[PDB]
Design a protein around this ligand. Sequence first.
Ligand SMILES: *Cc1c(COP(=O)(O)O)cnc(C)c1O
Ligand SMILES: *Cc1c(COP(=O)(O)O)cnc(C)c1O
Lengths: 404, 404
Amino acid sequence: GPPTSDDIFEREYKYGAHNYHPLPVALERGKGIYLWDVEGRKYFDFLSSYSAVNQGHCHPKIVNALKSQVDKLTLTSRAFYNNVLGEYEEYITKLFNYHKVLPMNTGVEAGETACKLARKWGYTVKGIQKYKAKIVFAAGNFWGRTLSAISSSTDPTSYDGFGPFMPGFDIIPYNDLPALERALQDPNVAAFMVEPIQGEAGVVVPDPGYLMGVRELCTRHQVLFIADEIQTGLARTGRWLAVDYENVRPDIVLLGKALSGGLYPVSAVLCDDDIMLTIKPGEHGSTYGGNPLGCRVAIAALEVLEEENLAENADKLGIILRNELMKLPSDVVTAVRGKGLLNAIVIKETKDWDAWKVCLRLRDNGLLAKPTHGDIIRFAPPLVIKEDELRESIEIINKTILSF
Amino acid sequence: GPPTSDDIFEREYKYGAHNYHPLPVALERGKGIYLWDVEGRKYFDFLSSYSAVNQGHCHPKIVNALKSQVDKLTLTSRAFYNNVLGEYEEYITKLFNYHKVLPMNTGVEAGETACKLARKWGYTVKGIQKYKAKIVFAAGNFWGRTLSAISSSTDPTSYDGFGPFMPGFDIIPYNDLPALERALQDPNVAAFMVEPIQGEAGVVVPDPGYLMGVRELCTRHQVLFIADEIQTGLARTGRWLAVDYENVRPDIVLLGKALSGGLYPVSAVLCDDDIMLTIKPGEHGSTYGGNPLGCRVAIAALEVLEEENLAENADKLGIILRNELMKLPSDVVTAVRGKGLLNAIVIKETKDWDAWKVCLRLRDNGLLAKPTHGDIIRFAPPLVIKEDELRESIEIINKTILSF
Ligand SMILES: *Cc1c(COP(=O)(O)O)cnc(C)c1O
Ligand SMILES: *Cc1c(COP(=O)(O)O)cnc(C)c1O
């Protein structure tokens, strides 16, 4: 088949579902912070696969871990034991400090597991009457595309037309303690699920003290605090978990994306015994969850973040990026925000230009990024980037923004 | 890290969730139809990872496909195009004869997507009033562990304790045309989802003509026929799809498990334009869905089934297996059933023995299998198995069954 970008677009339009509207670029190779298309052109990756490639594309140490296990064993299922799962479980639990881990594959799967864990704990420990348990969510949230995940969404694009919704899901505003407090008055609430920073909403960072307040309010009302760190976790914001900035310990933590460096779908639910053990043998599972292959790549992927001090780099580099982005004109950039290497700028949609246009020109100029709402562009380059490369990227951003 | 089977069991009991009760065997290597534990012992694999390794463990052609792509590109996300997704889409659609494919990762994800596709089609094409769409399922069904999947389950173990359930899900008996006809009288039904052969239920094969009747009933009442071939498809039963035995063409087909030969979580939803295009850009997705790496292994995994005539081998060998299991005494074994290489025997649970005990001794004798209900043992060996090896396996089964 088709070796031209236009041929690649055409073949997908014909044989694939139209559930996505991609930026017209056809990539075939990626290494570190770089991506090359079919026409041989080189691009700075400022999307990182939505934070799934924190360690850069095809990181050698992660790649070798995959190559080393494929020849040995890749899948036995959890009906038998393999030698790799135990190692990964011991490593991840001690690294984050929780008794146990429940392994799954994709991000939503981790979110569903946490909801099942919260409901089961709600009924068996808190003593909520059977099928009256509620889980509170914050407006702007994103945790996946299952029927359950779109039922807590405030985005019409996600739920409109998707049959009847999952009951028991409440929604309150984000970054609002009084709202939370009011909602937790209902003794039927089992958990509150939140993102320490809302990514898909447009990198909305809550006020300092928000996570501390949530922790206090949840502890006080005997409600589980579930932190979704699938996008904000793993060094992306400057810490192992974004929650670390306020020294807060959630009851359940969700990890996904970058947990495999982009080489395999691996996700995890971390929590202590009193919550985790409410699920008995045969009550929950997944065919590929906890397979030998994904466990090997996750160990290596976690090691790369540690050995290379990627959080520290993200933290230091994040400051420079943001500082430089605040110099741009206000008639184009109304806001700059973020933490570590998860940032965003807000474009002033006028009748001549918008975020999609800015992204296309940014592409023409060598940098890949995608808008999140038509006026919000997110910048999230692999954490392995160096200051010189970042400096180079910023020049492209300045050049592009100012050329309008 | 613990090198003993008992050390491996203990480590997992300590750091991992107790959602599974595995057969006490610790595997570390697998090749074709064989599995070796940590003590170096060899076993015939008669579970195949629940039909995920039809092509045998670590098939060289699939493994090389993975090794070849890891060095190039593994994940860009669907915010940009890659060069591999279009190829896989063109290949899979033409192979099964549907206009398009929507790529996902796990089996449940494919099932959720189909439910979303059915609800959207129900409202936009069939004209059902917003949020009145229903999907009918069959008792005994299994399509995953998300909150939505356990909502159509008739298995208490799957749903008990899991908060309130997803509305709009009706359940009728399996292998019952009159029940289906009665259910489809309701103009608010959008789809009927069924397994051609119910695997987890204990390999329950419906009567000849059942799939033809479902097709006629669905077509007549303008209801989508969704066939879940995640376990029965891909040569396992003797045909590309189990539905092929009756020459039936479902509206939506779900593939998973063996679509990657056990090397990566890849699943697919196949259907024509009139159903697929009800989902617009931005209305559905997955981070890892349709990634370059999984697409490469799926193409190779599909090619292996073709080039090696595994369907024909599964068909021919299934007859021998079943014939031999039928020579079994009638006081120990009650039933023998199946199609191709998806089979099961029903054990008479007496106060002295059961299916779990039979599997433990089967393990002691060199063969791995797991019971599905305490009196049902499923036999599903990789499709690459040869007659001599099957003959050898049968001797172990005879030896074991008769030693009680
Ligand atoms: C990516 C994401 C998810 C959804 O995960 P998938 O692997 O796409 O299912 C969940 N939560 C957050 C906050 C995410 O960014
Ligand atoms: C395995 C299976 C699934 C569930 O798939 P996962 O990959 O485990 O999510 C769905 N349907 C059927 C019939 C299956 O056998």
